[model samples]
Target: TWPAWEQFKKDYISQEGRVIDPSDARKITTSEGQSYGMFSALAANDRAAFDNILDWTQNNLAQGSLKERLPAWLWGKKENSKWEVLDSNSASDGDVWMAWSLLEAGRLWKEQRYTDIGSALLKRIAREEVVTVPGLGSMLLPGKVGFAEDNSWRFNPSYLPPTLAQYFTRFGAPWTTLRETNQRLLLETAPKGFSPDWVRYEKDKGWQLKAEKTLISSYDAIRVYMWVGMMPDSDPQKARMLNRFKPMATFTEKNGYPPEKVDVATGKAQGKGPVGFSAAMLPFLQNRDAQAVQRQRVADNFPGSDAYYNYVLTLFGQGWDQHRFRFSTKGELLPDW
Candidate 1:
């Protein structure tokens, strides 16, 4: 197999560094796509490819230098027949992935510039996105604004990935508190073993279910399991966090597959998740017997063609299965190049 990541660049990433999502009618390039492209290239030890992706992201999304500006979240051809940034707001997850990729790229390739830029990006993330909530203390917002107002705030549990933040802490950024808050945030909200797509966190009352929220553990929440699965056992919080989600493994182990949608509040499950969801469970099942169950399911049901997001998840989840890359407890990337 060529591996999904090898094909990922060929299909999505253009030679000039733009990563287009074919699912959209406009074929947009998001900071998230670019950051993932950077990560894929680094894992493959392709320096030229990584640089091209980074350059395009900076020139188009970050206004010339990511060192000075946060990369805009969306860019594409407008109805006016020209390309430009569609949204100026930065996605915190994209920013975090960019920093994580650069930090690891700097170490793997021995490039100081990558480290410096990556560190600066982290600080910018902290300044703009990290908030000191009355009760939650320092918590990460999905973006710099619009997610928080008055005492009510919206949080995507998967956005402030603990692995990325834990890694940034070693670089002198103030991510020291993120890991704890995220752990608390995830476990507190996911009482029924499934993380929600979105949750409301109020200043005084804590986690509350929102009717307008997605409320199901589907696409976004799937990554929450993957991130926790990849964390090192030595991580003080990882152990407790993994233990907290035991009901998920128990359910999957009994049901033979994970649910496509799960209600966090009611612990009710419906529908069957696609291959990507099975792939996302690779690390969480925790045993070879359980992991094999997931692997077989993914092999049997991978959705081909324009299934972009699911394919990306397979690259990350199955990439770990193939030993393509590993993340250190310190959040450093260990690629099997």
Candidate 2:
């Protein structure tokens, strides 16, 4: 937790602003990575780093101006020994974070260009990623494609954070719906006290199975707790959101570790979560039981001792837990500024 940005920059972010995540086989640079980099840089007030990350993301991910389109989600080496976008689809979660970082950069640095670009991206985002499912009203998709059906839609619960929607309302788009949908997504999807990694909406029906039928709360679902924890206490839904995520805190407190995976239907733990899971739990625990587990993970493992993905989660959780940043209901950023 001590200077996570410094260590993350040194270990993960390349000089050209590519965030290298080695968690997967390809070790590719993702839109998610770029978004996280920009977000961390903005919080750290490292304008130089922030611009570099955002620039690389535009040039590589968006292929030009971010105002033109959402950044591609996957980029890296391919089968033919070429480097390019492995997938052209846009992931809404990364797009939201990217827009968020840009807009906040605009405010903190007084750069209207950042604000314009960010706002433009949000407008573009509304066109592509935002949708109104048959029975679900308006909601965000997990990506531009592979997230919809003839009469149904798929979504990652972690993709739509209420804070991002609240922040986007000033952009003249239908962000109020975004905010409403985020709350509904959380409350409706986690009726059993655990958010699923994915959920689907079907026509003429309410919440149903995920397209993949995955019933576990794992990596993707973990961020729900982190975001809920990071939401400002002033938010009208903050208390309910916190209480909805309380089971994770309670489990961590009781077991001395979060589950590597939990059955969303049964609340059954399968395995012990990695150290980063503890790091992700910090805010939910308010730095109590989870802090002890997280610090032990930190004390046992230094930078580079674990996967890059874990470090990113550590930055998010540790940063917020240490008061590095916060978000207002009006979508303003309070980055210890």
Candidate 3:
């Protein structure tokens, strides 16, 4: 019993457009906003929306002056002059996300233009942005390079490697080499606080122990696991990596909404709030516990976040059943996994 495509259109598609402040009604569009729209469009299988969003990003956000186009984390805020870059220096996850979004849109829309742009972006990042430390594989350069050739050394452990992997796979390159390299780097360099939960920041050639640790939200962990599961079964590390987040999934089931933070060692819950994206993972993965707890969470926390609903609808297919969104498609929802 999958969620019906028509129903999804009715329920989630309407949520797209300019997200304005409820009180002020001012238009808000940022890198985050664009990424969320891309994700929603991908989930809905709506090629038109996906293409439109990609065009919007190129015209409005990507800084065209640099040798390699740099993506801002956010844009279109009046305080920042409505079209200013959020980070002036270098690139970050936002850039990779934009590349990934374009790649997905390319595949779904069957347009070589999108794919070509995506390939170009990845190549530029590899050449100018990603730093290949002896032990860290290809960690992203923090901020931008200065006129004196100085580079920021910070890194985010919560970064995605599959974004790069997908590119290699798409280009028919030897992706296995890069994939294995990243897997080893992530395993060795993972922060100590959360055995499996990657930290958000690192510094001075090591884990930034003093920086705030993010809890292993079911949503993020599930996506990571999906990537882990997608790795070749022959890879000895795959099983271990996938198993790392299994307990966290159980914890999420027990806690209801994924906690914003938890004691890394004891798995004790801590944090001020629940994020809508984390709650949306229930439907994305269709885990029984996530489904049971997230139904209410979705209704309460993400009343109008159609992107989340789109994720749910895409994964489940067309109907609600057995505490999960049922899928009509015979094949798996995540082909990569």
Candidate 4:
């Protein structure tokens, strides 16, 4: 394994294979962590670690079979002191990534088991986590439950990476529509070139901002830039998304740091973003001068042991910049290996 990945595993992942978020009080192990761990392990070409992680996830989160059920999004110590699945609902983002990683692992490692398992997981996601909006066509809900109610639905734009969407189109039916709808979700939701952390759509009202939260773009939205930036240049969607989110790069250039929070409607930003944000902007800021600034920042302030989210962003954004792995126009993972 590479040094950065080896270090990450040492910090965040347990010997038992669960990726723990020490930043959280409960020391939670979310499907997000497990999925990211799977991706990192696969990219590092550490087959043993990949199996260990998948085994832990299947046994703990999926109740032993991903084929039968999507893994629960949250697992942690409960108030009663038992470490168990906290919320049974499936998070689509984690589910999709795990499936995508599995598929890629199958291809890269030539394992039929991984391919079959990934295929089954993808089909399950399509059945349980995808829906056709009245005007939006087929779209991926943030989770299997709770994101949809009445005629309004909630979506996280960062949930579906465009490259993965491109790859999933081969699955046909719902996927083809889901990919198109995800593109719309990215573009239509970010009217001011900054994606929101969460958005809602109503059948009669069209796209609506979160009235309660003051329409802030931060944290989750940051990954939108990273995903767009990581897409191969030949992919038509990459250029489209890059153009749509140029304001983020512009703002970072002017301020010398990404804004921790951005008012999506007004484009007013506040607070200096952390080191991870700098690392995340590496791929999005195409101009060499602008890119170099953030590149140096990442080098200067790499994420520390307790910074789980930051480290993953570094692994993704800086990892991409370093040419450790890349996605093709068709969404296949082309690792340096």
Candidate 5:
């Protein structure tokens, strides 16, 4: 019934459960990939696939239990040619998606073990990844490490998806504050209506736009549009975010494709984006004509087997277009069951 999901599994997933990125020479699998795979499996209502993805993630990435540790962010063949976890550092976005998917799977499938593990993982994430900045208060770091330094912190606006952040507020404390802080992060960092790949905040310096690569919005920031577009229109934050990012839609409409990169401050766009960029903009473009244009582009240039990132974006963007799933005003996933 789900053609895209079936093809994705056939193309990328190993029989052993790893969601390998065959495009990489190392054939790497990240916590991000596993998290997205689990999310897709849940949306497709494939319980066996969900369990296999989770089991492989837990066993290989989390040292056998997600409850005890966050999955390592990188796993692949290393310099010595042995396949293993290359980096033990965790990515906050992957951690949140894993936790959210597990929690939703528990709710949708009535699995107590999934609920228990999901709750534990969120708590672990809160302890490790959430931080308090001088002016920002409770904020989600990009990861547990390397994001915080003396009197300053680094953040990725795309890391904490608004819907997922809203879902977390029900957990209390830091999440409650993080919801507020993350909203500010989304709005404040996007001065020209474009989110950057990364932003740095210094105690007295405010948002440090001059950081090496902080001014460009490209690969990592595409999700910002997808996340906002997928947000239920009735959600209070939806309209505000849509207006804030309207430039992206306008740019895509004018250029016939989303820009491969945009200067977040100058709004100067670079090369034409790949097929996935068009897919990501599908749900974001409010104009029917623009939406139709992107829809045609996706149909004509649907990602191939080698395009791991592009294909996943297509599943999220096109899958939503197909009425596969939705997010509620309260930010809970509403998968078509």
Candidate 6:
């Protein structure tokens, strides 16, 4: 039954081989388009689909000239007749996401090509795009290097750590500096009202906060706490950080939805409300109950975010221990925990 449902999802929701606009020759899915499918491939352990998606991204979406490579968030748009780079800075969330995706693919697929590509991007980001504050090691902002004061390292603090951790784990490098910096920012930087939602900053003052209180961010924070908690049992800071996230866990349970945004003071849901994208973090953090409920919600609601409905489905695939999918070389899908 679950496999049948997964096939249905791949056909309709995942839209694996579908052409968005037949009039144009845009074959690969958009950045937002590929996200759910990417997650789906991971969830189902479909290596062919995963490799296909990556190949499509590299051929259609990635921008480079032998010297520098970049990934555009939106690809296959008619407006972009030639391959287009979405942002001028070459340092944005889209790039980070692409890099992270490549890294994940590399790890799960056991291919060096993907890892090499992902590592190159990260290095470029670290060298050219990211900023290292006295306390913060590697943080990305919205603009390129040497652009303006506005281009300073500023963004959702949650974005870098998990990927950073993954990079460190995969490469055997010291991302401790990077991870510690993120922990400090997430745990201490925000004021009293900002415990849950990390505020966005432009220049110095606060920018308009995000509408969604991201489950991904919360999960990252929790994972960080877990990692910190596991360190020798005598670390007081580890214990402190773990306790900090306890309130967030309670908040997540109470909301019944991993919200996209919430009132910082009252922890009330706000803006675009509950998005399926939040479900992606479930496997990484082991929030089985929340993941199950969220997956069911997505299957029932079929919500759309920037063009993909399978975000919920992908997370559901990741979270469901009994019905998990695994890939075989002949493109056969097998069930495993």
Candidate 3 wrong stretches, greater than 4 Å = 1-28, 63-68, 79-83, 89-91, 142-152, 161-178, 189-238, 265-268, 272-291, 299-301, 305-337
Q: Give one clash count per candidate, in the order shown.
A: 0, 1, 12, 0, 0, 5
TM-score versus the correct structure, for each prediction: 0.94, 0.94, 0.65, 0.98, 0.98, 0.61
Q: What's the CA RMSD for each of the models?
A: 1.8, 2.1, 6.5, 1.1, 1.1, 7.4
Candidate 4 residue 90 Cα shift, in angstroms, is 1.1
Q: Give the TM-score of candidate 2.
A: 0.94
Which of 1 and 4 is ahead in lDDT?
Answer: 4
CA lDDT, every model vs. true structure: 0.83, 0.81, 0.47, 0.91, 0.90, 0.46
lDDT of 1 by residue, 1-337 (tens): 2367767777777889888888987789898888888888898888988999999998999889888978999998899888899999988889999988998899889999998888788889889888888887888888877999999988898886677867867755357777678878888988887888889888788788643348778888988888888787788778877887777777778888888888888878888888888888887778788889999988887747577788778878888777878888777887788
Model 2 C-alpha lDDT versus the unseen true structure? 0.81
lDDT of 2 by residue, 1-337 (tens): 2377888888778898889876656669989889999988888889899989988999999988899989999998887888789898998889999999998899889999999999899888888878887666778888888888898887788886777878887765468777877788888887668899988777888678442347578989988888887777777788898778778888888877888988777677778877677777877676465567766775576447337877888888777767888887776788785
Candidate 4 Cα errors over 4 Å, as ranges: 210-214
Model 5, global lDDT: 0.90
Best by lDDT: 4
Which is superior by TM-score, 1 or 4?
A: 4
Is candidate 1 or 6 superior in lDDT? 1
Tens digits of per-residue lDDT, candidate 6, 98-141, equal 56656666766779887788788666655665565433445554
Clashing pairs in 1: none
lDDT by residue (314-336, candidate 5, tens digit) is 99889888888888876788888
Clashes of 2: 1
Which candidate would rank higher by lDDT, 2 or 4?
Answer: 4
